Design a protein around this nucleic acid. Structure first.
Ligand SMILES: [Zn+2]
Lengths: 613, 1322
DNA sequence: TCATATTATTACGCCAGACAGGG
DNA sequence: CCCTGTCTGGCGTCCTCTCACCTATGA
């Protein structure tokens, strides 16, 4: 009754079953602002029975408690106004069932739903690892007043816009919205309204809506970008940018301080992520929340206007694919004719066959990748001119919405050399993609390769979860409990180099960590930075300009604090811009941030210089 | 030619390869196994006769009486299957066994017995199988799932790397019997051979040789060859066959015949062996340093002194040679211990052995097996002679002896079930050979090494357990038997056999509850091959390789239909064409290929036969003769897919469906999907609910017909003919005369099972699909079951789907649905709930069934009668009352009255009541008694009259050869009829023959109706104990709503997000809205591109349907329809279908075109499907654009979507994960007993488990107060939660926390040890 | 009904941790 | 007496939903 997974510790004292809680299937609802979620009326009237009882007893409609329970058992016409007056400013904790890190419990404000499904704002889904293929979430109600304030001030979904494992934003726009942006801010060499001049972004959207120009048609506009070059003062500079119609329409949504060159490019997924990141580093939190919502709304709207389907003709077969396969078949014929006459060894034969099928696979991938990335060739006022294609699967790949090089490779080019479960590769590849039909043997080899992957994930998840458990129980105690340990020791952060090109730069390792002694400028004996400064982005840029060798920085393992970690030897807060506060549990967020990517990890001569120096 | 429901709607069948072997009956594993179990099969194998011929005749220990066997039988079941499911009894049969007791006198092995007695005794009841492969165990309908276990017979396993931490391989060898003790041999890293029995302690293995009465010299004769040292002129020369020097270093001077052959230093090559064989070199003189390391073979004794020189297996030194040379033993036999090949493993094991003779070997084996209790001669000898060598407790079966002789390369395959000396010695020899290098190991995933148990084998093993218990009981009663005052039921007892066989059929890991929501799901739960179960591996332990697909699965096990999660690849599903071998292995069909011409004869192979041959591929182009049109063809030799010549192959695959199963060969365009999404597609396709209106997949594979027939959910006609079609109650089929028996005039009356409960609360319902007066053939379907449409298989429905992002409402995998889907009720499924109410006599008198419901007012007596219980039908919801069932003294009354659960609605469709003999008021119980009483007689006479009408006419019909006088035959009406003489010439006794029929009809009807009333007149039929037994069947009708789950056949899951109006849908320029919008972004990542080809080909199918709907609505004479139908059925490449359409009588064209105006159905088979050019060509026959993509406008803005989008028809299914079975919320209610925390689940009104990682997530924030109320006030602390509820309803959000109760439970459980845990200072 | 009290299967995979054996 | 096979214990993912089945004996 004590030990085990089902004893008292792991089953009734660390985890408890909980009143004022609910559970249902999730769905999208993209009209939401990212601090609010949809919550059904039936669940809302069940979870908030005591607040409704208290409200009903305050008005004077009833007398005893029984009367109120009969009123909400009957659900009369007056308790729905009571319910909209108990919801209004009362957050709830939404929780997806495998919570791995702290962004899997977030607090929203309810918006009542005719329905029986929790409507969950889409950007927030990338935090929960929540798709909508049958998922379920639990709602919990903060009862007391300190818990409502903790849900609004610590656990609100507007407050979690950076992942605590690093500095990367977690409210990155996921899949439909990056397709809507990548189709919006792009260009083509001729459209309606090529090379006309526009007096502002407002009439750019007016020309797109009336039907006189196209969403991607290159155009000189006059935009007024606000650069804040003074000390907190926004200076207007207006100019004519040679841009498109879609870039001006998306400029109507960008806040004041960002420059126009954040939208002047094509805006895949990495570019929109660093757009939101530069907005958070410059303009702070509230413009970044409202701008994340306006990004999501305009991405959904112009992805709807795009009509970006997928067809059977979109997967363009290379015309050179069959001759490449016949040249590889002639090469394996030469190698096996040498094998009949015994000139070569068996291992060298197997190595030569795997090498020519790897070379033919790379050539087929380059043939289809040229045939997709520049297939469109349209003329403008004369001879032809080429451009990047508006093929649907190519925009779904190039935008980074869903797809890569490998998946679009397997839908058009040959799908490689699949490997048998012995671990060694199979010498006869799967020369047929998915647009052509796989025959029987090729699909069976494919099933070898995919059954191994499903078995690996379904057995990998147990070790990933047990690793997170061991990590949060070794951490478990360590709380930021001082402000300075008063030391001069700390580890020597250098960039890491394995022997190829320099892998992880110093700005990734010494971003937001407080230096141990003051870094000498690389010239001679200068106090470039002082000895207890947090290295945020401005300091790291003045480190990259001076090409600083390596920084002696303060590390947690050198902290002199008895029973805890001081506030300087930890570093930056990582989801807050400042230093770690006195109190915030860093052992648990650290253990979750190491063990949470446990699913994505796998389970089962001489020196040649490259550069010149 | 076609049958008559085949000419209704003949599906356009793509497919180029002519099929040679039609699909076998898909439930043949279950049916053939259980038909083997119960069948009167003389020669004894296999069945119940094997059990009775093993256990009988029982003779006691010289008790001079020997009960023997004659014959067995199974009587009728007392309950047919329907009333058996209704009542709750098992569907069983009584097992009537004839037993013949003969009793001897003194001294009669040969003497005649003094007395006999014989009777048809009754032992157990065995559960029979329903005709569809199911059991009915206790009211519920269960399925035994066929196991996949290791075969009996020897296995040579390696375990090459992990032990010893030194890279040294071991080699063990397991002799797995079908029944009995396990014997394993195994090396250890000191290169010594060890035996262990039943995974016990480790004995050095040659002791088992010393247990088989082998001396040391005989063992060394077996495992070693002799090298002969002859005492000669000098230095004791050596016989040397040159094979023994292979690969070793020449230590000495190799010379003979006055010639130096090989000098010292160089290794001996095979050319030197050829020199020694050409030069005929045997005898060479050795130095004394050569014999100074070798080991003697046999014993030698000094002759004159009379003592021992050396024991066998002793290494030799020079002074030992001085001992044995001077005595007079001229021959010296040494053991050739080659370090390369012939290792000295047995000899070093003999050096490890602490034993010397046979008796100490048996004493050490007995001290291993049974410790503590002493080892005496009789006890140890009986132990070891009944370990392996008696027919009782050790039995390799026929499978085991076949594998045992096959793995040792024996010639024969049939032998005795026990082992012998030579078998154990051969296993040790093959293990030593594998260590030496020759021969190799076996793998365990190889399906030639992996047998299938099925229903008959498992029930036979449990029945044999019951029979050995009843024979120990018969041996008990007989030695205490007094004669002649007992007859054979004081000896025998029906209890242990029935107990064991109901233990297996009720509570086993394989007799499990049938997934019954779908015809597919029934027919693919019956074809399931589980690795789990008794004697097999477990879910949470193993492994990686047994969860993985091995190259012997090609055509035996489906590669892609295995459930994802904790058991992947343990719950494999059987392929389409794969039968089961005689021994239980998996044999699959192949086409025998003698020479260039591929012959149409089939021939079945298993994996231990598939390796030797060379087997072709299913789709390799052969034209008009069977000759492979290439000179090279892809085949597979020994699990290796490789390219071979035109004329080397011996077999070809039969058909191209044969790799996959019946779940994942219903997916069209399987070959274009990814493997992962085909797995998710098949596993979700098992989960579909039956819709209210079944709708014919436009893009099918043609295997829908075989699944919908072979799963017994449709009423397939037994005998062909016409129809009478009363049908409100039953289809009545008049039988054509050729299929009709001479006696038993006979017309077939099919029972339609109307609205009733499935095992997954779905609705199984049959509807007649034939009209009145319409010809049907044998094997044709008559009534469409759940999820069937004219004999095809209609799981979901086909809807117009656009691929586009639509305003974010289909973001990750969500699905946006029009209102035209929910207005038409085209997913509005029907669920049925059984609810029981009983009024058991717990304590303080019995409970009561009365409407006079207390405290509760004129809100109890409402949907019920004046005597209590729900009054049937009605629009009942949640919080209603169905069965008033409350006791007094329980001003002390209460409300246990079974009500309707919270959140559900419905209509009471049926009320069953076999209650405590008394449920009645003053008369409803007996009121209905008279109703049924008069009902029976009516139909009884009616049926007789029905036949009488047919017979009367038949009398006159035959009345021609013996009185055709039409005006002299219409005498008496209901009195007599025929009255004429005949004599001889032609036999016209027909009148007499039919006279007996009517005479017997009335005579039997009376008796038939005599028992009817007898059966009618009764309290009711059920078991005892339970008193008030009221079951009420609600039927909720759930429509579709934001939150349900839909999915196609390709793995495209979706939670339907927004239920749009019709106006806001994307309409094309023709005006029709699209029904369902999916999302294109799923398609490049999830590489299931087959849903797009299904979309385009379904678009083309409905294009033909719209074209026929125009040609038939704007009505044309049938020449233009038959021309367009002929063009639609020719269409393209060389196919198998074409049609013979000009023989459809100018009406069967029109009835076909009436059944095609919703869309022309297209069969795209599994791997030989429709190519893309045929999709384009079919889209050109309909007037649709060739790209598959139409420009679509927006319903909101009226303006065109740029870049035209894909619209087509995908067959989308509604899975039974409905959102108002998942929605749940809890504020406050009931909790558990032991702990003070809330209960768990939905059926218990309970709250969410706020688990461990959520607590770590709140610790990760600063949520200290949220966590404090999350584990103290909201959950556990009783004073805290009552103060909090009062604080909330006063308007004061403040918690008074206290200490959790489960921590004080922890303190008392820790303190209830010898542990003093406390709570210190303030 | 009201005290009487425990036997004839094996088929995980590391990975620490303690123990008798022997150069 | 310091290496050493060998044996014994102790881990092995969270959340949820549906169903059935529960010791023999006995004057
Ligand atoms: Zn410190």
């Amino acid at each position: 009754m004590i030990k085990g997974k089902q004893g008292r510790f792991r089953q009734n004292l660390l985890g408890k079953r909980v009143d004022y809680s609910g559970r249902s299937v999730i769905t999208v609802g993209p009209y939401l602002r990212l601090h609010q979620c949809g919550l059904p009326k039936k669940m809302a009237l069940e979870l908030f029975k005591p607040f409704i009882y208290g409200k009903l007893e305050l008005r004077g409609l009833a007398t005893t408690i029984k009367a109120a329970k009969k009123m909400v058992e009957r659900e009369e016409a007056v308790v729905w106004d009571i319910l909209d007056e108990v919801i209004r400013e009362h957050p709830v904790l939404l929780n997806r069932a495998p919570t791995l890190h702290r962004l899997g419990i977030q607090a929203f404000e309810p918006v009542l739903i005719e329905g029986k499904a929790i409507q969950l704002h889409p950007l927030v889904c990338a935090a929960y690892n929540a798709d909508f293929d049958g998922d379920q979430m639990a709602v919990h109600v903060p009862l007391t007043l300190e818990a409502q304030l903790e849900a609004r001030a610590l656990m609100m979904s507007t407050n979690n816009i950076l992942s605590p494992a690093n500095g990367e934003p977690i409210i990155v726009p996921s899949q439909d919205v990056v397709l809507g942006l990548y189709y919006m801010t792009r260009d083509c060499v001729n459209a309606k309204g090529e090379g006309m001049v526009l007096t502002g972004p407002k009439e750019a959207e007016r020309l797109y809506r009336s039907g006189l120009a196209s969403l991607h048609a290159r155009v000189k506009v006059r935009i007024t970008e606000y650069e804040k070059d003074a000390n907190g003062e926004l200076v207007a500079k207006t100019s004519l940018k040679d841009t498109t119609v879609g870039r001006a329409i998306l400029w109507m949504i960008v806040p004041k301080g960002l420059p126009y060159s954040i939208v002047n490019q094509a805006l895949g997924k990495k570019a929109i992520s660093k757009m939101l990141n530069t907005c958070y580093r410059i303009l702070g939190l509230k413009p970044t929340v409202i701008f994340a919502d306006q990004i999501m709304y305009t991405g959904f709207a112009y992805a709807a206007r795009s009509g970006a389907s997928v067809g059977i003709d979109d997967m363009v077969i290379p015309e050179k694919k069959h001759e490449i396969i016949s040249e590889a078949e002639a090469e394996v014929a030469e190698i096996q004719e040498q094998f009949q006459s015994g000139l070569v060894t068996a291992g060298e034969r197997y190595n030569k066959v795997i090498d020519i099928w790897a070379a033919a696979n790379d050539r087929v991938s380059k043939a289809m990748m040229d045939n997709l990335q520049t297939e469109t060739v349209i003329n403008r006022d004369g001879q032809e001119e080429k451009q990047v294609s508006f093929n649907s699967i190519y925009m779904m790949a190039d935008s980074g919405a869903r797809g890569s090089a490998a998946q679009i490779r397997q839908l058009a080019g040959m799908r490689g050399l699949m490997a048998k479960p012995d671990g060694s590769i199979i010498e006869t590849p799967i020369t047929a993609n998915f647009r052509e039909g796989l025959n029987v043997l090729q699909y069976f080899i494919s099933t070898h390769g995919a059954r191994k992957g499903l078995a690996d994930t379904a057995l990998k998840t147990a070790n990933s979860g047990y690793l997170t458990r061991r990590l949060v129980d070794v951490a478990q105690d360590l709380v930021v409990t001082e402000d300075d340990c008063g030391t001069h020791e700390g580890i020597m952060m250098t960039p890491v180099i394995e022997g190829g090109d320099v892998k992880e730069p110093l700005r990734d390792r010494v971003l937001g960590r407080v230096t141990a002694e003051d870094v000498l400028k690389p010239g001679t004996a200068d106090i470039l930075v002082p000895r207890n400064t947090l290295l945020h982005e401005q300091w790291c840029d003045l480190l990259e300009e001076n090409s600083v060798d390596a920084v002696k920085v303060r590390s947690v393992v050198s902290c002199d604090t008895d029973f805890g970690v001081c506030a300087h030897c930890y570093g930056r807060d990582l989801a807050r811009g400042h230093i770690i506060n006195k109190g915030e549990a860093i052992g648990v967020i650290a253990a979750q941030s190491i063990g949470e990517p446990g699913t994505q990890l796998t389970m089962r001569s001489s020196i040649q210089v490259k550069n010149k120096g | 030619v076609y049958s008559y429901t085949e000419k209704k709607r003949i599906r356009k069948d793509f497919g180029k390869r002519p099929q040679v072997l039609d699909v076998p009956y898909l439930l043949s594993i279950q049916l053939d196994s259980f038909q083997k179990f119960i069948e009167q099969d003389p020669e004894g194998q296999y069945g119940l006769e094997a059990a009775f011929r093993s256990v009988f005749p029982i003779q006691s220990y010289s008790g001079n009486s020997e009960l023997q066997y004659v014959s067995y039988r199974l009587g009728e079941p007392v309950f047919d299957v329907q009333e058996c499911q209704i009542r709750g009894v098992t569907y069983s049969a009584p097992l009537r066994v004839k037993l013949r007791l003969v009793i001897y006198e003194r001294e009669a092995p040969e003497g005649t017995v003094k007395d006999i007695k014989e009777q048809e005794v009754y032992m157990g009841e065995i559960p029979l199988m329903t005709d569809n492969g199911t059991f009915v165990i206790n009211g519920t309908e269960r399925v035994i799932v066929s196991q996949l276990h290791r075969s009996p017979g020897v296995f040579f396993d390696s375990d090459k790397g992990k032990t010893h931490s030194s890279g040294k391989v071991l080699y063990n060898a397991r002799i797995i019997p079908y029944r009995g003790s396990w014997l394993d041999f195994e090396f250890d890293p000191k290169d010594n051979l060890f035996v262990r029995i039943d995974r016990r302690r480790k004995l050095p293995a040659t002791i088992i040789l010393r247990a088989l009465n082998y001396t040391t010299e005989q063992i060394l004769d077996l495992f070693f060859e002799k090298v002969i040292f002859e005492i000669r002129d000098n230095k004791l020369q050596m016989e040397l066959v040159p094979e023994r020097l292979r690969g070793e270093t020449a230590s000495f001077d190799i010379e003979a015949n006055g010639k130096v052959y090989v000098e010292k230093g160089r290794r001996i090559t095979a050319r030197h062996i050829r020199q020694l064989e050409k030069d005929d070199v045997k005898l060479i003189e050795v130095p004394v340093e050569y014999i100074a390391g070798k080991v003697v073979a046999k014993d030698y004794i000094d002759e004159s002194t009379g003592e021992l020189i050396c024991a066998a297996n002793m290494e030799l030194s020079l002074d030992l040679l001085a001992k044995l040379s001077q005595s007079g033993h001229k021959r010296i036999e040494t053991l050739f211990t080659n370090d390369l090949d012939h290792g000295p493993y047995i000899s070093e094991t003999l050096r490890v052995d602490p034993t010397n003779d046979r008796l100490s070997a048996l004493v050490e084996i007995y001290r291993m097996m049974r410790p503590g209790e002493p080892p005496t001669r009789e006890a140890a000898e009986s132990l070891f002679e009944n370990l392996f060598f008696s027919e009782d407790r050790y039995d390799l079966s026929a499978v085991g002896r076949m594998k045992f002789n096959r793995s040792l390369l024996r010639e024969e395959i049939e032998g005795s079930g026990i082992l012998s000396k030579d078998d154990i010695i051969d296993v040790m020899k093959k293990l030593i050979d594998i260590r030496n290098g020759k021969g190799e190991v076996d793998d365990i995933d190889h399906l030639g090494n992996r047998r299938i148990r099925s229903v008959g084998e498992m029930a036979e093993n449990q029945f044999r357990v019951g029979l050995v218990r009843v024979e120990r009981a018969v041996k008990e009663r007989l030695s205490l038997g007094d004669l002649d005052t007992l007859m054979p039921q004081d000896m025998i007892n029906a209890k242990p056999i029935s107990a064991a066989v109901k233990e297996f059929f009720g509570s086993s890991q394989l007799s499990q509850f049938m997934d019954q929501n779908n015809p597919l799901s029934e027919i693919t739960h019956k074809r399931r091959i589980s690795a789990l179960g008794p004697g097999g591996l477990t879910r949470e332990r193993a492994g990686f390789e047994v969860r993985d697909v091995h190259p012997t699965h090609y055509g035996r096990v489906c590669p892609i239909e295995t459930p994802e999660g904790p058991n992947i690849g343990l719950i494999n599903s059987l392929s389409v064409y794969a039968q089961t071998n005689e021994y239980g292995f998996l044999e699959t069909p192949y086409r025998k290929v003698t020479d260039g011409v591929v012959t149409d004869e089939i021939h079945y192979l298993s994996a231990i036969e598939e390796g030797n041959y060379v087997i072709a591929q299913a789709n390799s182009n052969l034209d008009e003769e069977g000759h492979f049109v290439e000179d090279l063809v892809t085949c597979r030799s020994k699990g290796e897919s490789s390219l071979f010549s035109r004329d080397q192959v011996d077999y070809m695959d039969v058909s191209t469906q044969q790799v996959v199963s019946v779940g994942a060969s219903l997916i069209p365009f399987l070959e274009h999907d990814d493997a992962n999404r085909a797995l998710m597609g098949a596993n979700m396709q098992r989960q579909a609910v039956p819709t209210l209106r079944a709708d014919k997949p436009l893009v099918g594979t043609g295997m829908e017909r075989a699944v919908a027939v072979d799963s017994g959910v449709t009423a397939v006609a037994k005998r062909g003919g016409v129809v009478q079609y009363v049908d409100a109650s039953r289809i009545v089929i008049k039988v054509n005369e050729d299929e009709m028996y001479p006696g038993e005039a006979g017309i077939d009356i099919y029972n339609l099972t109307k609205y009733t409960r499935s095992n997954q609360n779905t609705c199984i319902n049959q509807m007649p699909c034939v009209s009145l007066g319409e010809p049907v053939e044998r094997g044709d379907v008559l009534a469409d079951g759940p999820s069937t449409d004219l004999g095809e298989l209609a799981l979901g429905q086909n809807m117009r789907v656009a691929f586009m992002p639509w305003n974010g409402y289909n973001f990750e995998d969500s699905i946006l649905v029009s209102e035209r889907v929910v207005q038409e009720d085209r997913f509005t499924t029907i669920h049925i709930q059984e609810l029981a109410c009983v009024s058991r006599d717990t304590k303080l008198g019995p409970e009561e069934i009365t409407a006079d419901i207390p405290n509760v007012g004129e809100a109890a007596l409402s949907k019920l009668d004046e005597s209590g219980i729900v009054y049937i039908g009605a629009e009942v919801t949640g919080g209603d009352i169905l069965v008033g069932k409350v006791t007094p003294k329980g001003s002390d009354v209460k409300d246990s009255s079974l009500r309707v659960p919270n959140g559900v609605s419905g209509t009471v469709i049926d009320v069953q009541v076999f209650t405590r003999d008394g449920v009645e008021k003053d008369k409803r119980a007996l009121e209905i008694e008279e109703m049924q009483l008069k009902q029976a007689k009516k139909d009884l006479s009616e049926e007789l009259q029905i036949l009488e009408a047919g017979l009367f006419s038949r009398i006159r019909a035959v009345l021609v050869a013996g009185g055709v006088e039409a005006e002299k035959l219409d005498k008496l009406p209901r009195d007599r009829w025929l009255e004429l003489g005949l004599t001889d010439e032609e036999k016209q006794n027909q009148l007499e023959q039919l006279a007996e029929q009517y005479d017997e009809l009335k005579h039997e009807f009376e008796k038939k109706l005599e028992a009817k009333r007898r059966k009618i007149t009764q309290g009711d039929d059920l078991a005892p104990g339970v008193l008030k037994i009221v079951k009420v069947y609600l039927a909720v009708k759930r429509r579709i709503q934001p939150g349900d789950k839909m999915a196609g056949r390709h793995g495209n899951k979706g939670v339907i997000s927004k239920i749009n109006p019709i106006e806001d849908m994307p309409y094309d320029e023709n005006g029709t809205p699209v029904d369902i919008v999916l999302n294109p972004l799923g398609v490049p990542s999830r590489m299931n591109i087959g849903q797009i080809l299904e979309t385009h080909l379904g678009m083309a199918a409905k294009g033909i349907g719209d074209k026929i709907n125009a040609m038939l609505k704007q009505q044309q004479e049938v020449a233009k329809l038959r021309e367009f139908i002929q063009r639609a059925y020719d269409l393209g490449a060389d196919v198998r279908q074409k049609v013979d359409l000009s023989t459809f009588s100018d009406e069967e064209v029109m009835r076909l075109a009436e059944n095609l105006r919703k869309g022309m159905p297209i069969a795209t088979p599994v791997f030989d499907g429709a190519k893309e050019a045929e999709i384009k060509e079919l889209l050109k026959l309909g007037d649709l654009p060739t790209s598959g993509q139409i420009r679509l406008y927006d319903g909101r803005t009226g303006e065109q979507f740029e870049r035209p989008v894909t619209v087509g028809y995908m067959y989308m299914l509604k899975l039974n994960h409905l959102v108002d079975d998942k929605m749940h919320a809890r504020s406050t209610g009931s909790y558990s007993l032991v702990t003070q925390q809330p209960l768990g689940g939905k059926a218990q009104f309970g709250g969410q488990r706020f688990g461990e990682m959520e607590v770590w997530a709140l610790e990760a924030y600063g949520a200290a107060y949220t966590l404090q109320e999350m584990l103290t006030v909201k959950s556990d602390d009783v004073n805290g939660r009552t103060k909090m509820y009062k604080n909330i309803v006063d308007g004061n959000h403040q918690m008074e926390p206290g200490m959790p109760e489960s921590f004080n439970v922890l303190l008392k459980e820790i303190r209830s040890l010898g542990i003093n845990i406390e709570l210190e200072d303030e």
